[PDB]
Structure formats: structure tokens, C-alpha cells
Symmetry: C2
Subunit: 228 residues, 2 copies
């Protein structure tokens, strides 16, 4: 059996969100390439997986990718996992995938947890068509602009936001889209205090300024109801 790269999703805060095939695959490969081996090691212990790990992240790629490709061309079975959910949505994973396609190594993606889509289905927002975006820009000036250039998308839009940034990002959202644009926040997805907060953007920006904001948020935004 030739070398195969397996893309394996991991839980987003609930260990039972692991799949049977994820367990078997991580047990079966010769090596697991992880963003955070210390964090990943916790997951493997809980499922009693003994597979060795190798670190693989954004400070590693230029050194790690050729090492990984080489072991794959030798016939090694390798898994790539991220810190939470769906790997290879981000650059370091996506980059290893392209190297595999280039070296004609097969890539087997396992289906599994994705926070943006999991939130989407419970949001009450129209779940199809949809535009997954992720984090808005870190730089204040660059964010206000990428929002304005999205104010006409007619579909549900999906963002992620870090807690300390939620308030300001909701305000910009409301500035660039309109206060009365429907939206939904998903806090603590898959954990004890999982919570959806639904309302307008103005309404949710306000709420963000009054509360203890903890944990990563999914921020869902209804599309423009009359574009162009």
C-alpha cells in the first residue's frame, strides 16, 4: 500500500464528537502530523492511541512538508490533524495537501466536526447557499473594508471571532451592513454552556458590550435582502 495522507477532524470541545474512523485511522497510520502535539496527545490518550506524532504548524511548513512527502513516497501512512475540528482549511494543512497532489500521493479526507457549519444548521438563518469566511482581518483598517466589500452578498455569511474582539467586530458589521441585518452568535459550541444568541447586529453589538465575553464565537449574518 502506497503512502496516503489522511486528513482527520478532531472534536471542537466535546470528545464524543470523535468518529469511529477517526479513532481507527489515527490508530492505523505510522505517524500523526499535529499543530499542537501536547494538546493532541491528550486526545490520543483518551482513546488509547499510541501512534507517534510530529509537529506541524505555520512555523514548520518549509521544513516539515519535504520531510513528510519523503516518508509518504517511502510508503508511510500519515495523518494530519489540527488543534480543533476540520484540518487543512488553514494554510499549513492546505499547503501539505497541494504538495501531495503534486507528488501524486493520495489524500483521504475524513468527514468530521466543523464549527461554522454545525452552528449554521441551528442558526435559523437560511443555510443554503452559504459563504464561509472565517476570521475577519486583524488590522482595524483592513476589516472595515472587507466588510463593505461583502455587504451585497445575498447569502448567509459565516465568520469566526475571538472573544476580546467580538464587540468591535459586531459594531463594524453593523456599520457596513446596516444595524437591522439579522445575525446569530454561537458561543461554546458542543460544550456544557453552548448557546445561540439571535437578533439584529445592532442588538448583538450592544449585548457584547454588557457581558463577560469568553470562548471563541461563531458569528453568522443573514445576507443582504436586496443587493447591488
Amino acid at each position: 500500500t502506497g503512502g496516503h495522507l489522511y486528513l482527520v477532524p478532531t472534536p471542537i470541545g466535546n470528545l464524543d464528537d470523535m468518529t469511529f474512523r477517526a479513532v481507527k485511522t489515527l490508530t492505523a497510520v505510522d505517524l500523526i502530523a499535529a499543530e499542537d502535539t501536547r494538546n493532541t496527545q491528550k486526545l490520543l490518550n483518551h482513546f488509547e492511541i499510541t501512534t507517534k506524532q510530529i509537529s506541524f504548524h505555520e512555523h514548520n511548513t518549509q521544513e516539515r512538508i519535504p520531510q513528510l512527502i519523503a516518508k509518504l513516497k517511502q510508503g508511510m501512512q500519515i495523518a494530519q490533524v489540527s488543534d480543533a475540528g476540520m484540518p487543512s482549511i488553514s494554510d499549513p494543512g492546505h499547503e501539505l495537501v497541494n504538495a501531495c497532489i503534486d507528488a501524486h500521493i493520495p489524500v483521504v479526507p475524513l468527514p468530521g466536526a466543523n464549527a461554522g457549519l454545525t452552528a449554521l444548521i441551528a442558526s435559523g438563518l437560511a443555510p443554503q447557499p452559504f459563504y464561509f469566511y472565517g476570521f475577519l482581518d486583524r488590522k482595524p483598517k483592513d476589516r472595515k473594508a472587507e466588510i463593505a466589500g461583502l455587504a451585497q452578498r445575498p447569502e448567509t455569511l459565516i465568520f469566526y471571532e475571538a472573544p476580546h474582539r467580538l464587540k468591535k467586530t459586531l459594531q463594524n458589521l453593523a456599520a457596513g451592513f446596516g444595524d437591522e441585518r439579522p445575525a446569530v452568535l454561537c458561543r461554546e459550541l458542543t460544550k456544557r454552556y453552548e448557546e445561540f444568541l439571535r437578533g439584529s447586529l445592532a442588538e448583538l453589538a450592544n449585548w457584547a458590550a454588557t457581558d463577560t465575553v469568553r470562548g471563541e464565537f461563531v458569528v453568522l449574518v443573514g445576507g443582504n435582502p436586496a443587493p447591488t
Copy 2:
């Protein structure tokens, strides 16, 4: 404990793509609302789940939703599952979710299999931002038009297509986007003969005319490299 609606993803052709929490949840609820109880019953047997089912699909919604809401307001724990993967992306599920939000019943989405995203991560196409679309229009005239109105999206686009329609849809894609637009087909995702075919749209339309086309396809299309 109040009534809760659980949205539970099911495999897309591999039974190990089931999650631990999916098993526990379907074991724990009082009732499971399924698109195809006969097909769903097979899944429950294999995991030895004995929970009763109730049919729920697009010919059922107007009768079933009020029945379901009522049992939820009584305190019943109910799960909704689709025929494959991620439920409540489609109308009948989405519609039950809105009724829950309206009646202030909690909705707990479980993370799980989604064919469009699972393909995406192995495609070699830029996986972020992305625009999940699903099936293009059934009516020939309405398809050629919805394609032209997407020819400027700069992100990866994700469609689904039925086998007998793959050839014609690839041709229209190439007519409305340009022959040289990069694309990827994902055939038999998660099954024995799982396969990604990567190349230009012209290239893949051609291939569709020469081969035995079986099973549902994911069809991924790179974004316009210079919009507007």
C-alpha cells in the same frame, strides 16, 4: 429537562463516519425524525439503537412540524436525521429548526459528515473563503443563468450533481466560467473507490462524456482569478 431538538449528522456511505455522540444521542432521545425510516432503520440496527422513528420529509412538513413541536413542548427529546450527512441544510429540516426557535425550544446541532466540505479539504483548491451552493437548477434554462451570475465570485465554489447530469452541468460550467477554470470532482466520497479528479472544466466535461458515470459527485470550481 425541557424538550430539545438534536440535529444529528449521519454517514455519507461509511458507517464508521458516525460519532460517539451521534450513537449516544440517537440512543437517548425518545423519538427520531427521519427522511427515510427504512434507510435510517439500517443505521440504527448496526449500532443497536432501538429508538422509535417518525417519518419527516418534504411531503410531510405541514403535518409533521406541529406534531413535533407539540411533543417538544411536552418535554420530549427528539432527534432529526437526514438520509446522508448534515441534516437541516435542506428545507424540511431548516423549517423545523425555525419552528423550534419560534417556540423557544433549544436546538442542539451535533458536528458531523458534510460531503461538500470533506471534499473541499482534499481538493487542492483554496479552501477559505468558500461558497457552498449544492445542486444547480433542475431546469436547463435556469441553470445556464445561475452560473453566469456566479462567474465573478472570486472564491472556491462547491456544487453537488447527480451522475446522469454531470456531463451537461460540466459543459455549462465551462461555457459560463471559461474552459480553463480549475475544478475538481469528488466521486464516491468515503467509499472503497473514492476518487478525486482534478483539472480544468473543459478537461472534466470531456472526461464525463467518455466514462461510466455512477454515484453522486461533489463538483468543486476555483474562483475567478480576476473578477468584475
